């Protein structure tokens, strides 16, 4: 009927809004993971440089 | 080593879903329109059959 | 975790597949309504023409 | 009186959703990749801190 079809369409709408919300959450968590990655790369760089410097220091004495 | 490209992909996704919402709305509008059109045609043809019945009853009585 | 995020993404996938299926049903019903419309328009045309012809017939006698 | 235009709109919608599916898949792939990358970096930095600790224990003993 009118109801049976309209409510179907609005049901689709609401499912779409739900998807959007969930994808927003996902975006947030993905962002957090990206920043995590970034910091890990920087930390890795510094620990590498530190190890190189301390290795050269030991190579001296 | 991929970084913000994937993030922009996510944003692109959210934009596409956002779009889908609006399109679904317009679809709903056109659907309702077609439903009204169908109802109008229905009752219209019913009454047309009324008048047709009456006028055929008139002619077939000369 | 790995699970908590991956299962989220696959959950989104499945919701998308669900939406697609539902939209397929909708497409079917919309098609049926369109054909219904078509037939109604044709029937309307013919009943109009019939009424015009029979009206002219009565206008004769 | 609108007809098949709306139908083509529906088809366009189904095509967009179909697309979203694939994009979500690729997204999943890149996500997994970044997760592995994060784990590698984690353990790598842990061991780097091991070696750093040991070598600092070596230097500070002259």
Author numbering:
A (entry chain A), C (entry chain A): 2 to 62
B (entry chain B), D (entry chain B): 1 to 62
Quote the passages of the study that discuss this structure, keeping the authors' original sentences.
The main regulatory protein YabA was also found to prevent over-initiation by inhibiting the cooperative binding of DnaA to oriC. Furthermore, YabA downregulates replication initiation as part of a multimeric complex with DnaA and DnaN that is associated with the replication factory. YabA is a small protein of 119 residues, with an unusual predicted organization composed of a leucine zipper at its N-terminus and a putative zinc-binding domain at its C-terminus. Solution studies demonstrated that YabA is a tetramer in which the monomeric CTDs are separated from the tetrameric NTDs by a flexible linker resulting in an extended conformation.
In both cases, analysis of the unit cell contents and lattice interactions indicated that proteolysis occurred during crystallization. The structure obtained with form I crystals was refined to a final resolution of 2.7 Å with good geometry. The crystal structure of the NTD of YabA revealed an extended α-helix, four of which assemble into a helical bundle. The tetramer thus comprises a central four-helix bundle flanked by pairs of helical extensions arranged as coiled coils. The four-helix bundle comprises residues 1–35 of the four chains with chains A and B’ running antiparallel to chains A’ and B. The interior of the bundle is formed by the close packing of the aliphatic side chains of L6, V10, L13, I17, L20, L24, L27, I31 and M34 from all four chains creating a substantial hydrophobic core. The heptadic arrangement of L6, L13, L20 and L27 gives rise to a leucine zipper-type interdigitation of side chains projecting from pairs of adjacent chains (A-A’ and B-B’). The flanking coiled-coil regions are formed by the C-terminal halves of chains A and B’ on one side of the four helical region and chains A’ and B on the other (residues 36–62). These pairs of helices, which are splayed in the four helix bundle region, converge at their C-termini where hydrophobic interactions of the side chains of M34, L41, L48, L52 and I59 with the equivalent residues in the partner chain are augmented by hydrogen bonding interactions of the side chains of N38, N45, T55 and most strikingly by reciprocal salt-bridging interactions between the side chains of E44 and R49.
